[PDB]
Structure formats: structure tokens, C-alpha cells
Paper text:
To address how these known relations to cnidarian actinoporins are reflected in the 3D structure of bryoporin, we determined its crystal structure. Recombinant bryoporin crystallized in the space group P22121 with one molecule in the asymmetric unit. The electron density map was of high quality and fit all residues of the bryoporin polypeptide chain, except for the first three N-terminal residues. In addition, 13 residues of the C-terminal linker, containing the affinity His6-tag introduced during the cloning, could not be traced in the electron density, likely due to flexibility. The overall structure of the monomeric bryoporin reveals a conserved actinoporin fold, thereby reflecting bryoporin’s high amino acid sequence similarity to actinoporins. Bryoporin is built of a compact β-sandwich composed of two parallel β-sheets of five and four β-strands, flanked by two α-helices. The only notable deviation from the typical actinoporin fold is the additional four-residue loop between the C-terminal α2-helix and β9-strand. The structure of bryoporin harbors a patch of surface exposed hydrophobic amino acids in the L3 loop and α2-helix that are spatially close to each other and conserved in actinoporins, where they play a crucial role in membrane binding. The residues that are involved in SM binding in actinoporins are also conserved in the structure of bryoporin. An additional notable difference between bryoporin and a typical actinoporin, such as FraC, is in the electrostatic surface potential, which is overall more negative in the case of bryoporin.
Bryoporin is a protein from the moss Physcomitrium patens, and its corresponding gene was found to be upregulated by various abiotic stresses, especially dehydration, as well as upon fungal infection. Based on the amino acid sequence, it was suggested that bryoporin was related to the actinoporin family of pore-forming proteins, originally discovered in sea anemones. Here, we provide detailed description of the 3D structure and mechanism of action of the moss cytolysin bryoporin, revealing its close kinship with actinoporins from evolutionarily distant organisms. Our results suggest that bryoporin could represent a part of the moss defense arsenal, acting as a pore-forming toxin against membranes of potential animal pathogens, parasites, or predators.
Residue numbers in the entry: 4 to 178
């Protein structure tokens, strides 16, 4: 679940997500910690679906997390959630939201990354605020776009693909 950040490739994420057979909505997320800080997982909140592997509790300096999630069998929902990492020594939390919906006639893929003050575990309120751009969260990000922004002394970069076997590649650096 943890590799050196410099070894992360889009091909690795493609392999991960394509290896989830049996459902039509799933995601692989590769998240690079390009800081010198240790990141501590505060949880994963699932709005829709689940995951078959535990998220890494610690992402150390210059490592990437590999994470995957998938929709549930027999349901008209997709894979949607938020994971969160506390930046040890900075008293801030980084949230990563993903949404790969069941119904592309109505909805599209979305993602978000936010840096907030304090130690903030993910939950339905945090997730909804990231999805809607409310409660002090930035507005979320469309797929097929390279996102670059700065928040609370950090630079955030990443992108998401557009379909039901989605990938997100995202990176945290000190600004």
C-alpha cells in the first residue's frame, strides 16, 4: 500500500483499477507525500461502496499511498468517499475526496483535495462539503484537468480520469 513516491506511475494505477473485476464502478488513487512530514491516517469515509484493502496508517516522507475502492454489488450507487491524513507537526489535515457515480446520465466523476487546520477525521459532513464546495472547502475538480493550487502553506497537484475505472494521481508538497 506504500511505495517510494518516485516509483508511482499512471500505469500502476491502471493495473490496480483494472484488476478489480465484477463491478462497473471502481477507482485507484495514488497519493504522493512529497514533504518531509509523516502523515497519519484519520480514517476513510465511504459515501458509496467499500474497499477491499486497508488504507495505509502512515505515509512517511517521499512515499506514495496506493489505495482502491469499488461500488457494492447489487446497488445503484458508485464508489464515493473521502480519506484524510493528519500532517504530524503542522496541526493540519489533508482530505482527498473521490466520486465515481453510478449514473452518468445524471452525474460525472469529481474529486477534491483540501488542506484544513486541526485534526479532522472524515465523515458525511466533511465529504458533502468537499463534494459541494461548501463549509470552507474549495470547489471540487473535474476530470481530465491538471489541477494546481495552494492551500495553507502547501502546494497541491493532481488529476482524475473520466470513467468508471477511474484513477486519481495527486501530490502534496510544501509551498
Amino acid at each position: 500500500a506504500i511505495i517510494p513516491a518516485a516509483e508511482l506511475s499512471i500505469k500502476t494505477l491502471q493495473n490496480i483499477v483494472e484488476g478489480i473485476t465484477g463491478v462497473d464502478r471502481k477507482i485507484a488513487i495514488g497519493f504522493k507525500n512529497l514533504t518531509d512530514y509523516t502523515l497519519e491516517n484519520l480514517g476513510v469515509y465511504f459515501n458509496s461502496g467499500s474497499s477491499d484493502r486497508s488504507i495505509a496508517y502512515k505515509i512517511n516522507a517521499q512515499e506514495a499511498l496506493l489505495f482502491s475502492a469499488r461500488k457494492s454489488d447489487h446497488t445503484a450507487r458508485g464508489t464515493v468517499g473521502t480519506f484524510s491524513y493528519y500532517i504530524q507537526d503542522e496541526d493540519k489535515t489533508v482530505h482527498v475526496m473521490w466520486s465515481v457515480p453510478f449514473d452518468y446520465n445524471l452525474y460525472s466523476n469529481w474529486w477534491n483535495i483540501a488542506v484544513v487546520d486541526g485534526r479532522q477525521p472524515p465523515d458525511s459532513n466533511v465529504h458533502d462539503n468537499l463534494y459541494n464546495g461548501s463549509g470552507g472547502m474549495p470547489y471540487p475538480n473535474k476530470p481530465d484537468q491538471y489541477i494546481n493550487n495552494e492551500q495553507k502553506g502547501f502546494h497541491l497537484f493532481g488529476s482524475m480520469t473520466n470513467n468508471g475505472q477511474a484513477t486519481i494521481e495527486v501530490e502534496l508538497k510544501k509551498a
